[PDB]
Design a protein around this ligand. Structure first.
Ligand SMILES: CCCCCCCCCCCCCCCCCC(=O)OC[C@H](COP(=O)([O-])OCC(O)COP(=O)([O-])OC[C@@H](COC(=O)CCCCCCCCCCCCCCCCC)OC(=O)CCCCCCCCCCCCCCCCC)OC(=O)CCCCCCCCCCCCCCCCC
Ligand SMILES: CCCCCCCCCCCCCCCCCC(=O)OC[C@H](COP(=O)([O-])OCC(O)COP(=O)([O-])OC[C@@H](COC(=O)CCCCCCCCCCCCCCCCC)OC(=O)CCCCCCCCCCCCCCCCC)OC(=O)CCCCCCCCCCCCCCCCC
Ligand SMILES: CCCCCCCCCCCCCCCCCC(=O)OC[C@H](COP(=O)([O-])OCC(O)COP(=O)([O-])OC[C@@H](COC(=O)CCCCCCCCCCCCCCCCC)OC(=O)CCCCCCCCCCCCCCCCC)OC(=O)CCCCCCCCCCCCCCCCC
Ligand SMILES: CCCCCCCCCCCCCCCCCC(=O)OC[C@H](COP(=O)([O-])OCC(O)COP(=O)([O-])OC[C@@H](COC(=O)CCCCCCCCCCCCCCCCC)OC(=O)CCCCCCCCCCCCCCCCC)OC(=O)CCCCCCCCCCCCCCCCC
Ligand SMILES: CCCCCCCC/C=C/CCCCCCCC(=O)OC[C@H](COP(=O)(O)OCCN)OC(=O)CCCCCCC/C=C/CCCCCCCC
Ligand SMILES: CCCCCCCC/C=C/CCCCCCCC(=O)OC[C@H](COP(=O)(O)OCCN)OC(=O)CCCCCCC/C=C/CCCCCCCC
Ligand SMILES: CCCCCCCC/C=C\CCCCCCCC(=O)OC[C@H](COP(=O)(O)OCCN)OC(=O)CCCCCCC/C=C/CCCCCCCC
Ligand SMILES: CCCCCCCCCCCCCCCC(=O)OC[C@H](COP(=O)(O)O)OC(=O)CCCCCCCCCCCCCCC
Ligand SMILES: [Zn+2]
Lengths: 75, 226, 230, 73, 61, 141, 141, 152
């Protein structure tokens, strides 16, 4: 006969009834890419604030190749 | 039931030390005169004596076989009583939900006493109304003043007693032919020989019939330090 | 059938315990208070005896009721610490520029964190054994050694500190927050001294309570360590 | 809870210990153990100290070295 | 296959060990099992907080 | 899991709302009679009709929940369950390892540097003439 | 005709259900742990895994597998001596199964076989096996 | 030296002097090391649970010596704590409305000293001793007593 080691079997599913438990569409099982992006931004802000102290006090002279109403100027 | 705790060790079997030492009188006592411990060992001794005799089982009718094991044959009266007992026990820790009650099929409200408090919540959906509590007393067909649902009290009563599993057994089960101690001895020798004891309840039971501490090793078995 | 609950009709410990409390107020000697505290300990033990005897009722909801009571107690302990943190941070604007020596961030914090982490690991192993229906004798004595070091370190720190409660609100809050944590460590000693193996196992409320409580004490110290030492 | 299979894909048995013969390299054994018991506990346990250590020790460059070379006065 | 007394022979090496090693292994095994664990057995059995709760309570029939 | 929950982590009584998936539907099934076809008018109500042990599935659920409590061998769970049972224990152990082998070395290094240079290696050196170690957590300055 | 019976479980808290009298008889028979015995059947893969935990059992388990024996674990410890009886026992059990299965319906006569080699049976109740949990080797060697 | 084993086997043997490695690699050796009452339940353990338990147990015990070393260094540090400058009594420093007596409501020992101000108490105890009233403490040189953690 043939057998499966219980330790490596898959988790049993929730029973399908009138009262069925379902977590498949919740998206709460694990941290997603958005969470790891927040971590990346936190690291970037932490490094950036220390590296460039004058960033919070930017220069006021404005020089635009295509003026201030051109999209590249805004960013 | 969900409101019961874990099964105890006794819920499965009893220790042999609880076996009554006067086995000869135990097997002759009528069922109505046997206590919980006495009844347990009467059934186990008599039940295992028939089950440990393979050559006789095929020729034994189910009625006789059920009697030997102490199992009660079901009939409409006994089934009715047992069913209402379990419903009462279930409702101790479970919700009370069922079909809408009418004159033809009143809501059944099991009770041991003459009275039990009940609430009516109306029908389903919009027909459901606020809880209306009332005292459901025996002998009246109660009608909710709001939804006109019909309630009735069912009493688990019988001859100055309330229905219990033991009461049902005593009322309906009939003692058969008196247990023969020769069968106990015959089965005892079948499974217990030359220091091998594969039928231990019979070994103890046979020892008690012979007095106490007669069979090999039983004196050492009964000697305790505390 | 039977009643859902086996009612308790009478009790006399409540009167004794309440009177014991009053004796603290009406004392004329602090020696009476010391002996009064022993009476309180004795009578509280009797109350714990009644809880164990209630197991005979075989009531499924008894475990749940006590567990949620502990949850409420844990919340009260957390909120009590919050008030001390509130007191500490209210005067934050007056700290760090007064002529007092604040604690170092290298020695005390590291060894205490390491020491208290070991305490958590010991309790975790106790929980694992409790899951496996198993026991290890040495574990309890590791806790006692752990508690011995904690007492020895805290006693020396207070005695060798060169600033006093009356020097500044900073010092008062430091001493008080550290004492409050110690008292909760001592309460843990009170609980853990009776740890044994009971054969009814996972229906024993004591095991889950001890695991929750020890975890709370350790996490509270992390907050204290960040606030005061780091 | 979402049911899911066991992710462990390493060897399930090394065989009976016979004076440490016919067994994998030590580093491979350490990797197998963590696979068997779960990397999630490792990452969670080490995450706090790694975050604190990096933040403090990064100041050696961010706070000390850069500041000396970047002071407009 | 030869079975040695539990805790007396190592399985890590084919060589049982030298006299000092054997003395340390045998005597720690004895000290743990028959000397140190006396204290634990004494605390677990003779001073159980939960047993003391049922002292004087009638037996359960 | 550590905490007791009546619905999921019910280890005090072991009650389970549904039977195991091993049993065939004929042997035992979850208690669901929501799909029962309409009752013919000529049928008459014999039982109470009340939700309870008269229903076969509920009776079998109650029976199994009591008789499952004795089993010859363990019902071995998969490694995923075993990991979850001691998730906190394993993580606290790894946290202890991190404190010993990560925090300890750099904390020791900082104190040694502080001895020679009067301030931790992760702090700006002062020019104001005040003596002492100064701050430790630089990013909270 | 098979009458229905009440089956009750529990000592102080008693649960009653309707059951098959024959099934209950089998249930109580299987509770006679000294009479009705569980027996193990091996496969090559499982036998190999046993060696990881008990080398001696692996060798004895291999013998049982090679002869296709369903064997009790206690007997397996003495398979070196019990093998000739176990082979004889296997043949007698197979003979009895063939006879009873092949018999026409309603024929409940006992099978014809040599019960002296089948254990546990009234003809042979088995041997008093001594415990093998004792050490034989000297630690200092 | 013994040449009947490899170097790795020799190292493993000595690390196994208390049997830790043997119990890890043998289920039988582990269960037999349990006391009989708890060995009854050992059959239900999976190998994953057994080895995981040992891993947690060994990590804890192996880390205890390290914590002891840290505690000893802490005790030595406190035993020889360098003196600090005497505090200048600033605007809001050392404010008192009443004497310190909460420790001794009736005896009122060292009413002027703070609860853990050892040097103040020492001089206060000396006054009481000079008044023929005994008091315990502060009399033995630190280097002449055990467990002081102040010896050279
Ligand atoms: C040639 C010999 C070489 C020896 C080298 C030294 C080795 C010393 C090892 C000491 C380890 C102590 C660990 C303490 C934590 C608790 C351990 C534990 O759980 O025990 C359970 C164990 C059994 O418990 P159980 O409940 O029955 O069973 C539970 C399990 O089921 C079953 O439990 P288990 O069997 O799995 O237990 C595993 C293990 C778990 O723990 C570990 O494995 C941790 C190992 C940590 C290593 C620490 C080494 C420290 C050495 C430092 C040296 C520094 C020198 C500096 C020099 C400076 C120069 C300027 O526990 C033990 O084995 C503990 C030690 C048992 C000895 C008991 C007998 C009394 C003490 C004998 C000491 C002999 C020393 C000889 C030295 C000779 C040198 C040539 O408990 C006991 O045996 C009872 C209590 C006593 C145990 C602690 C004894 C402490 C002895 C310390 C000796 C070293 C002192 C160094 C001083 C240096 C000053 C400068
Ligand atoms: C920056 C670096 C430094 C960081 C420092 C951090 C410092 C943190 C300090 C924390 C101190 C320690 C506290 C916890 C000690 C125990 C630890 C432990 O054993 O953990 C492992 C263990 C893990 O459990 P497990 O079952 O093995 O879980 C397995 C898996 O994890 C998966 O489990 P699962 O997900 O399947 O779920 C099962 C488990 C999952 O649960 C847990 O495992 C709990 C884990 C908590 C860990 C602590 C994280 C921090 C929580 C912060 C909460 C903030 C509350 C809001 C504050 C607002 C302020 C304005 O459920 C339970 O165990 C149920 C426990 C009972 C909960 C009762 C909650 C009552 C309060 C409800 C909210 C009240 C406000 C309502 C407002 C809205 C009104 C409309 O946790 C427990 O079993 C602990 C439960 C017993 C203690 C509960 C204490 C509740 C206190 C409630 C306070 C409410 C105050 C409300 C007023 C406030 C404003 C005035
Ligand atoms: C050309 C220029 C180029 C320039 C290049 C520059 C390069 C720069 C590189 C920068 C790199 C940045 C990277 C950012 C992205 C990160 C992505 C990532 O992985 O994020 C997620 C990652 C991990 O998150 P995750 O994925 O969710 O974790 C996975 C888990 O396995 C989830 O699984 P789990 O949930 O199952 O986990 C286990 C969990 C399972 O839970 C359970 O089992 C259930 C119960 C849970 C509740 C527990 C209740 C309480 C328990 C009681 C027991 C306590 C024991 C301890 C007691 C202690 C007593 C003292 O249990 C636990 O974890 C908790 C129990 C374990 C022990 C807890 C110990 C206490 C914790 C609280 C205190 C923490 C503070 C301590 C402070 C120190 C001490 C005071 O997050 C982080 O690592 C945080 C991000 C940090 C960012 C820092 C940025 C600043 C630093 C920059 C440094 C470099 C700058 C150098 C200069 C450059 C100049 C140019
Ligand atoms: C604060 C300062 C630093 C403090 C650091 C503290 C560190 C504490 C670590 C503690 C570790 C315990 C290790 C236990 C090893 C047990 C094995 C063993 O050695 O058994 C031998 C042997 C076994 O015999 P057997 O079992 O019959 O074997 C016969 C077989 O046929 C043949 O079978 P076999 O061949 O297998 O048996 C022999 C085999 C047995 O051994 C092995 O094969 C070992 C295999 C397992 C190894 C696993 C790792 C063990 C743990 C390592 C810990 C490393 C610590 C590193 C510390 C660094 C500190 C900087 O090989 C050996 O015997 C080699 C032993 C190697 C010992 C290494 C000692 C290094 C000392 C370094 C000192 C550095 C000082 C720096 C100062 C700087 C100042 C500026 O019996 C003993 O253990 C003998 C005990 C009696 C010893 C008497 C010692 C007398 C000392 C007199 C001193 C007088 C001073 C006067 C001063 C005057 C001033 C004016
Ligand atoms: C001043 C700050 C506070 C300190 C002063 C004293 C405060 C005293 C208040 C004590 C409150 C106690 C509340 C307890 C609620 C939880 C009870 C509980 O779960 O106990 C049961 C639980 C498990 O029992 P089982 O039988 O398995 O199951 C129970 C039934 N299912 O048992 C335990 O918790 C065991 C407890 C053992 C240790 C008892 C120690 C008592 C300590 C009292 C301290 C008094 C000190 C007084 C000092 C006064 C001067 C400062
Ligand atoms: C072919 C390529 C080979 C490359 C090999 C690379 C080898 C690199 C080895 C690096 C070793 C680094 C060791 C650092 C140890 C520092 C120990 C230390 O500071 O101890 C003190 C401190 C406690 O001191 P306190 O006085 O209390 O002060 C702090 C709290 N108040 O204790 C600790 O830190 C204990 C923790 C020890 C950490 C040990 C780290 C070991 C790292 C090994 C790395 C090996 C890498 C190998 C790479 C191989 C690539 C082929
Ligand atoms: C067999 C004997 C065993 C004895 C040992 C084991 C048991 C130990 C029990 C736990 C002990 C916990 C003690 C808690 C109080 C500690 C007091 C303390 O340290 O206070 C001082 C510390 C810092 O002070 P400084 O000296 O200025 O620090 C300068 C450093 N050189 O903090 C304080 O001053 C605050 C003091 C708060 C004390 C609160 C304790 C409760 C006292 C209540 C008294 C009530 C009396 C009135 C009548 C009612 C009686 C109930
Ligand atoms: C009562 C007090 C409690 C303590 C105080 C809490 C205050 C803050 C609490 C916030 C919530 C905490 C949990 C967050 C969980 C999480 O990460 O949640 C992760 C989620 C994504 O979820 P999933 O990945 O799981 O699907 O992220 C988000 O929804 C938002 C964070 C992602 C990144 C946002 C980017 C912000 C951009 C800002 C501008 C940057 C400019 C850069 C210029 C170069
Ligand atoms: Zn109504």
């Amino acid at each position: 006969y043939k057998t499966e080691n219980p330790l490596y079997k898959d988790d049993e599913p929730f029973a399908k009834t009138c009262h069925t438990f379902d977590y498949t569409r919740e998206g709460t099982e694990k941290n997603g890419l958005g969470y790891y992006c927040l971590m990346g931004l936190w690291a970037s802000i932490f490094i950036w604030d220390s590296l460039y102290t004058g960033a919070t006090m930017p220069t006021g002279v404005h020089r635009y190749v295509w003026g201030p109403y051109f999209p590249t100027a805004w960013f | 039931y969900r409101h019961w705790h874990r099964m105890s060790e006794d819920d499965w079997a009893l220790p042999l030390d609880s076996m009554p030492e006067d086995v000869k009188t135990l097997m002759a006592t009528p069922q109505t005169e046997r206590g919980f411990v006495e009844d347990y060992w009467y059934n186990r001794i008599r039940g295992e004596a028939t089950l440990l005799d393979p050559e006789a089982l095929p020729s034994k009718s189910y009625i006789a076989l059920a009697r030997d094991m102490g199992l009660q044959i079901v009939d409409e009266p006994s089934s009715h009583m047992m069913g209402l007992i379990e419903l009462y026990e279930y409702l101790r820790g479970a919700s009370f939900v069922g079909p809408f009650g009418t004159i033809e099929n009143p809501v059944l409200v099991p009770a041991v006493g003459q009275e039990r408090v009940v609430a009516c919540t109306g029908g389903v959906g919009d027909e459901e109304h606020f809880t209306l509590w009332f005292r459901c007393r025996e002998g009246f067909m109660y009608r909710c003043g709001e939804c006109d649902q019909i309630f009735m009290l069912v009493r688990l009563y019988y001859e100055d007693r309330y229905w219990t599993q033991t009461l049902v057994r005593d009322t309906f089960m009939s003692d058969g032919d008196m247990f023969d101690l020769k069968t106990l001895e015959r089965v005892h020798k079948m499974w217990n020989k030359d220091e091998m004891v594969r039928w231990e309840v019979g070994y103890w039971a046979q020892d008690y019939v012979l007095g106490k501490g007669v069979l090999p090793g039983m004196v050492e078995e009964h000697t305790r330090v505390n | 059938f039977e009643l859902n609950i086996n009612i308790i009709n009478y009790n006399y410990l409540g009167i004794i315990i309440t009177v014991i409390i009053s004796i603290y107020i009406y004392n004329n000697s602090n020696i009476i208070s010391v002996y009064n505290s022993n009476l309180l300990l004795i009578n509280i033990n009797i109350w714990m005896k009644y809880n164990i005897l209630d197991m005979l009722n075989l009531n499924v909801l008894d475990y749940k009721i006590l567990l949620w009571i502990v949850v409420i107690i844990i919340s009260n302990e957390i909120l009590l610490f919050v008030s001390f943190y509130w007191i500490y941070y209210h005067n934050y604007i007056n700290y760090y520029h007064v002529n007092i020596l604040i604690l170092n961030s290298y020695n005390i914090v590291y060894n205490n964190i390491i020491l208290l982490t070991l305490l958590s690991t010991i309790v975790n192993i106790k929980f694992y054994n409790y899951i496996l229906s198993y026991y290890k004798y040495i574990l309890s004595y590791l806790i006692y050694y752990n508690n011995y070091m904690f007492n020895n370190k805290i006693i020396l720190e207070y005695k060798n500190n060169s600033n006093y409660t009356n020097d500044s609100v900073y010092m008062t809050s430091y001493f008080y927050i550290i004492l409050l944590h110690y008292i909760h460590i001592y309460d843990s000693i009170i609980l853990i001294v009776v740890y044994n193996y009971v054969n009814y196992k996972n229906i024993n409320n004591y095991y889950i309570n001890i695991n929750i409580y020890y975890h709370l004490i350790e996490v509270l110290y992390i907050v204290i360590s960040i606030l005061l030492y780091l | 809870h979402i049911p899911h299979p066991v992710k462990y894909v390493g060897p399930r048995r090394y065989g009976r210990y016979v004076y440490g013969m016919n067994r994998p390299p030590v580093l491979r054994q350490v990797k197998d153990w963590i696979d068997w018991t779960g990397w999630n506990s490792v990452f969670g346990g080490f995450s706090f100290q790694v975050a604190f250590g990096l933040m403090i020790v990064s100041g050696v460059y961010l706070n000390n070295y850069r500041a000396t070379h970047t002071l407009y006065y | 296959v030869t079975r040695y007394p539990s805790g007396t022979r190592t399985i890590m090496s084919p060589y049982p060990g030298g006299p000092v090693y054997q003395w340390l292994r045998i005597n720690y095994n004895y000290f743990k099992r028959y000397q140190w664990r006396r204290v634990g057995r004494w605390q677990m059995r003779s001073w159980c907080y939960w047993k003391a709760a049922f002292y004087g309570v009638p037996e359960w029939n | 899991k550590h905490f007791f929950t009546d619905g999921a982590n019910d280890y005090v009584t072991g009650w389970e709302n549904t039977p195991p998936l091993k049993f065939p539907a004929s042997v035992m099934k979850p208690c669901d009679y929501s799909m029962t076809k309409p009752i013919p008018k000529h049928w008459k109500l014999r039982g109470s009709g009340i939700h309870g042990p008269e229903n076969t599935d509920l009776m079998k659920l109650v029976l199994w929940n009591r008789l499952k409590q004795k089993r010859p061998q363990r019902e071995v769970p998969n490694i995923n369950y075993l990991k979850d049972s001691i998730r906190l224990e394993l993580s606290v152990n790894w946290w202890l390892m991190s404190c010993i082998f990560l925090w300890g070395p750099w904390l020791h290094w900082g104190q040694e540097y502080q001895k020679v240079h009067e301030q931790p290696p992760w702090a700006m050196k002062r020019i104001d003439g005040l003596r002492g170690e100064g701050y430790f957590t630089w990013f909270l300055e | 005709q098979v009458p229905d019976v009440f089956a009750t479980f529990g000592w102080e808290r008693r649960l009653t259900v309707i059951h098959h009298p024959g099934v209950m008889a089998i249930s109580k028979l299987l509770d006679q742990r000294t009479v009705v015995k569980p027996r193990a059947t091996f496969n090559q893969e499982l036998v190999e895994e046993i060696g990881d935990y008990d080398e001696d059992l692996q060798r004895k388990a291999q013998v049982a597998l090679d002869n296709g024996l369903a064997i009790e674990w206690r007997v397996l410890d003495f398979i070196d001596d019990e093998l000739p009886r176990l082979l004889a026992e296997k043949r007698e059990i197979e003979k009895a199964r063939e006879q009873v299965m092949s018999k026409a319906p309603g024929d409940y006569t006992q099978p014809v076989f040599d019960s002296s080699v089948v254990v546990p049976t009234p003809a042979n109740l088995g041997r008093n096996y001594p415990t093998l949990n004792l050490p034989s080797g000297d630690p200092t060697e | 030296i013994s040449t009947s084993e490899t170097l790795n086997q020799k190292i493993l043997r000595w690390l196994d002097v208390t049997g830790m490695l043997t119990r890890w690699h043998s289920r039988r050796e582990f269960i037999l090391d349990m006391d009989p009452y708890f060995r009854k339940n050992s059959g239900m353990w999976t190998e994953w649970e057994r080895k995981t338990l040992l891993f947690l147990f060994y990590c804890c015990t192996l880390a205890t010596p390290y914590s002891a070393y840290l505690d000893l260094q802490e005790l030595k540090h406190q035993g020889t704590k360098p003196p600090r400058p005497v505090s200048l009594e600033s605007r809001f420093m050392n404010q008192r409305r009443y004497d310190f007596t909460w420790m001794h409501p009736q005896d009122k020992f060292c009413s002027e000293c703070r609860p853990v101000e050892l040097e103040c108490k020492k001089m206060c105890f000396d006054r009481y001793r000079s008044m023929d009233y005994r008091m315990y403490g502060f009399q033995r040189p630190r280097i002449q007593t055990y467990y002081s953690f102040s010896t050279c």
